[PDB]
């Protein structure tokens, strides 16, 4: 119920919190993560599949590649966002 | 867009024969095609600098009913060292892809 107030950053942070959108001597920050050429973090199964494909020297087939590309496009479309037609038809 | 389908495509029936021996059925497909009534073409898809076939091959038969009868008879027939499974060739080209895209939106 908190709107975005002008010249204020606490209201947007409160709306995002309410919406649920949130030796030598050293401390080395050893962080290991799996990423792809698209920059998206990869699931461990996906990372293992990529590693196995690179190690075996052969990638996936054309049909599998097309299915993966279609799935990625669908995911991108879904993450980017019929009530009016149902209101007009009623 | 590999220029290799311009020699066997003559408004004929293309049959994809897979599940064949990798080191066998090099020219046995030609014998099968000669046994088939049409006996037009029996091309085998193989990779260059590999020494073995790539699996499924394309058999072009002019007579469609004869091709269907041969596919019914040769489905699972022991050819070479493994039974060759015969199905219909896809042949999804750029024009076919464009037509499929046009029909998908409508």
């Amino acid at each position: 119920e908190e709107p975005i107030v002008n010249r204020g950053l606490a209201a947007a942070l409160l709306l995002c919190q309410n919406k649920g959108l949130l030796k030598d001597g050293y401390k080395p920050d050893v962080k290991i993560e799996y990423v792809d050429e698209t920059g998206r973090k990869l699931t461990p199964k996906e990372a293992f599949r990529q590693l196995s494909h690179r190690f075996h020297g052969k990638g996936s087939g054309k049909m599998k590649t097309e299915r993966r590309m279609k799935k990625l496009d669908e995911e991108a479309l879904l993450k980017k966002m019929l009530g009016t037609v149902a209101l007009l038809q009623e | 867009e590999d220029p290799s389908l311009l020699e066997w495509d003559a408004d004929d029936f293309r049959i994809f024969c897979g599940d064949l021996g990798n080191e066998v059925n090099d020219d046995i497909l030609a014998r099968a095609f000669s046994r088939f009534p049409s006996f037009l073409k029996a091309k085998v898809i193989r990779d260059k600098r590999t020494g073995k076939t790539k699996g499924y091959g394309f058999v072009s038969f002019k007579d469609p009913s004869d091709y269907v009868r041969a596919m019914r008879e040769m489905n699972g027939k022991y050819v070479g060292s493994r039974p060759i499974k015969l199905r219909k060739s896809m042949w999804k080209d750029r024009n076919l892809d464009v037509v499929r895209k046009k029909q998908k939106e409508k």
């Binding site: 669908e74 479309l77 879904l78 966002m81 019929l82 | -």
Partner: protein, 56 residues
């Protein structure tokens, strides 16, 4: 069988909608309905079948 038919009808209503219109979170009002809903929606693992403490 009635709960299975209701879960199959919910799965058919989810499958009739496109992927852009399919939801990713399902809130079950009845507590004895989320258990077949995990079985009837095995083809779409991206949906979350969660319970509801407040009954609408």
């Amino acid at each position: 069988l009635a709960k299975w038919k209701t879960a199959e009808e919910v799965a058919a209503l989810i499958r009739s909608l496109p992927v852009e219109e399919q939801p990713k979170q399902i809130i079950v009002t009845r507590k004895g309905m989320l258990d077949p809903l995990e079985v009837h929606l095995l083809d779409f693992p991206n949906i979350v079948i969660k319970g509801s403490e407040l009954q609408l």
